[PDB]
Ligand binder design. Sequence first.
Ligand SMILES: CC(C)(COP(=O)([O-])OP(=O)([O-])OC[C@H]1O[C@@H](n2cnc3c(N)ncnc32)[C@H](O)[C@@H]1OP(=O)([O-])[O-])[C@@H](O)C(=O)NCCC(=O)NCCSC(=O)C[C@@](C)(O)CC(=O)[O-]
Ligand SMILES: CC(=O)CC(=O)SCCNC(=O)CCNC(=O)[C@H](O)C(C)(C)COP(=O)(O)OP(=O)(O)OC[C@H]1O[C@@H](n2cnc3c(N)ncnc32)[C@H](O)[C@@H]1OP(=O)(O)O
Lengths: 387, 387
Amino acid sequence: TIGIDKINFYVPKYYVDMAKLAEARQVDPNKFLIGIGQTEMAVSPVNQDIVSMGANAAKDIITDEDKKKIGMVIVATESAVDAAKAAAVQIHNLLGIQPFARCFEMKEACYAATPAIQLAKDYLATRPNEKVLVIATDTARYGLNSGGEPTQGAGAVAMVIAHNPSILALNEDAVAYTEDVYDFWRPTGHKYPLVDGALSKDAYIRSFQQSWNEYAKRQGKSLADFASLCFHVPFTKMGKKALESIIDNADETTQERLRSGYEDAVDYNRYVGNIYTGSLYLSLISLLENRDLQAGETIGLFSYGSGSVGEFYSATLVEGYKDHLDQAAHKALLNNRTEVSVDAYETFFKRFDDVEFDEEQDAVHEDRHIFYLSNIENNVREYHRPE
Amino acid sequence: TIGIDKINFYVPKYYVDMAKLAEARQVDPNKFLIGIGQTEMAVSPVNQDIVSMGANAAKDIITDEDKKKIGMVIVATESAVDAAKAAAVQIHNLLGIQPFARCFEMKEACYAATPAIQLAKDYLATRPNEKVLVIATDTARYGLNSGGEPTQGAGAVAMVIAHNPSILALNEDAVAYTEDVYDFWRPTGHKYPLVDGALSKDAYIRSFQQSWNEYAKRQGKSLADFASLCFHVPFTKMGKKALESIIDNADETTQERLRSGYEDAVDYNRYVGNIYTGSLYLSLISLLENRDLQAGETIGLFSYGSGSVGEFYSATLVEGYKDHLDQAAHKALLNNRTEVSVDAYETFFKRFDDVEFDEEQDAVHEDRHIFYLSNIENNVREYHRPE
Ligand SMILES: CC(C)(COP(=O)([O-])OP(=O)([O-])OC[C@H]1O[C@@H](n2cnc3c(N)ncnc32)[C@H](O)[C@@H]1OP(=O)([O-])[O-])[C@@H](O)C(=O)NCCC(=O)NCCSC(=O)C[C@@](C)(O)CC(=O)[O-]
Ligand SMILES: CC(=O)CC(=O)SCCNC(=O)CCNC(=O)[C@H](O)C(C)(C)COP(=O)(O)OP(=O)(O)OC[C@H]1O[C@@H](n2cnc3c(N)ncnc32)[C@H](O)[C@@H]1OP(=O)(O)O
């Protein structure tokens, strides 16, 4: 068996209340709270870039034996800080992983972490003694008062792929679907994405339907075979709509089960926002910790990336996986964050666009036990490492 | 076995003579002709972006039947035109490849095409009826009157990976070496890379030495076991220096063989320049066509990417591979190119920086049988397709 042996996520220590943003934005809060289904939005302090966030997600799950057995570090992102250098090189360094490993990035909007773990599995096929570290790290920024602003978020998800995994076994049924469309994209030079809101909803659902249909055809399966589905989450309601568009043909028992699983799946996401490549996987953690799925049961996953590329595959829960999750820590991570006014949020957002450091505003003193961008000198990013 | 079944490259129809650039830059021509080992530099017309170049390199080697079997289209590049949408999506569209395929970019300077074909191989282990299309496409631009300018170039290399390859079988002996260093990089926003000239030379050589040494140890092999070696080529002398720093230990017969093989390997690169991710693979085509290696003989390859990541692996020639290469087309591609003065060159260059269209300067009417960027409306690139 080969699959997700360890998994974890990290989000920045700040967040803005969606009800507060709605008011500040002069809109019905329920448009956010219910309409798109988001309650709290992660706010990025300058001392947290995709590298530090990435390192932070991975630090709590990487052991010494892991550092010795990891043969590849893959970073999925659409929030790259370098046009050439893979953020995976810095993370590999910060984490102290053994030198003889491949380090690179994969890019395709919100889709990239999927081909990373899937190809990681393929790589491990004949390497039972090796492991692979996949990191999804991104900052979803649309710009103040923009259409996509309410769906913004930032964070990272780290996954350790290996043989005889403790949590999930990746099955051999993945099928991808590519369709050239301009629902969302970010031409070089643009700080923020260009987006056709309505079309992005249609593109997502179509990609999901095509992928699922072909999957169902190739594997001779139906929704009833799944304990629960897990989707890429730009905002909780997006996946809800996509799910609804196909479960009508399913039985009432199946409809109730998948509808319930979905809620557990998007529990964490509601308090973070879109984290691009990591959204699906943050949702997977939420599902694994908020639901009591039994070992042996199968989960169906749909990965999406605007542009667009979609993919559906399954994974089976390993015996005793509950003993390898960190629900308490994750609950704490979200709860122990500090709320910031819409005003402060906008200040943070502006400073971030220019990487304007400020140990006081970012409250750098509090981050003694984590990785953070401490400074940029001579176009080189420097990082503080967990004391 | 699994490996490179088909391989081809494309470079733009323009080039500037290096002796000329030397005069213009008020330097001794030999500094470029001999010093760095470059004779003709590829010049990018605006109507050729990484997408059109990529498609052009691939169009000649994929049959209608292949479009049905290709399961993944991976593009390696550090010259992306979108921070989110993978160029692999547009190419997949332009080539008419079947819809159920993964499309994405891999990024890590000039190293990226290597993990792409290597993981392409692992992916095919389970799918004997599928193929994988890997495309290295880049525009090495340092800036007029810059240190790196003499090593500039542009082009793309397409490789079809499949079972029972017609040209080269990729062996299972690859070993990568990562080391966080700032020899070359390009922070988001910078049109041109930042580079530590000298340091980049030491970084390249160190990565090759550390990669080879470990490879030799793990495989219990030595330079004498190789018919020839192939290296990433920023400029022909760079590989020469790297090879020389390691062959001293070898016997006279091995040194003579590998020195000759190297010259055949860099024959084409001398008239094109650095094409980043595609350099090593353009060199592989040069070696395959200019040398007369026999079936069963083994080639040693070193892939490098500033940042840095290095990898050494081997490949074994397949009987009859010569009949699967397009030496004529290639020889013609380089020779049938049109020359341009250092003046025309600099105008082309400045126009490229802002994608300033001009069907007269770019002589678009001559490109009826190829793909090319014909316009950009509403931030969306449009392309002309082979008549
Ligand atoms: C998300 C949109 C489209 C929203 O755009 P919007 O105009 O701000 O909000 P809306 O007008 O479209 O409607 C919001 C929802 O709330 C409801 N509503 C209305 N008023 C109220 C009220 N008072 N109380 C309760 N409910 C209310 C309303 O009915 C609607 O529900 P729906 O009709 O869809 O069922 C926009 O912000 C946007 O473009 N966001 C970003 C795009 C995006 O996330 N796309 C989703 C799929 S594409 C994807 O996931 C890929 C992506 C985005 O990650 C890119 C990548 O891969 O990198
Ligand atoms: C870039 C990537 O893709 C990643 C990599 O491969 S990293 C390794 C390669 N690095 C690069 O390609 C970086 C880009 N290029 C550069 O930084 C620079 O242009 C360069 C380092 C390639 C050359 O720098 P330069 O200062 O312009 O020329 P310089 O270093 O002074 O010398 C050029 C060579 O010609 C020789 N030379 C000088 N004048 C000469 C003349 N008139 N006749 C003949 N030879 C001459 C020099 O001796 C030197 O050779 P050696 O190093 O073997 O002695």
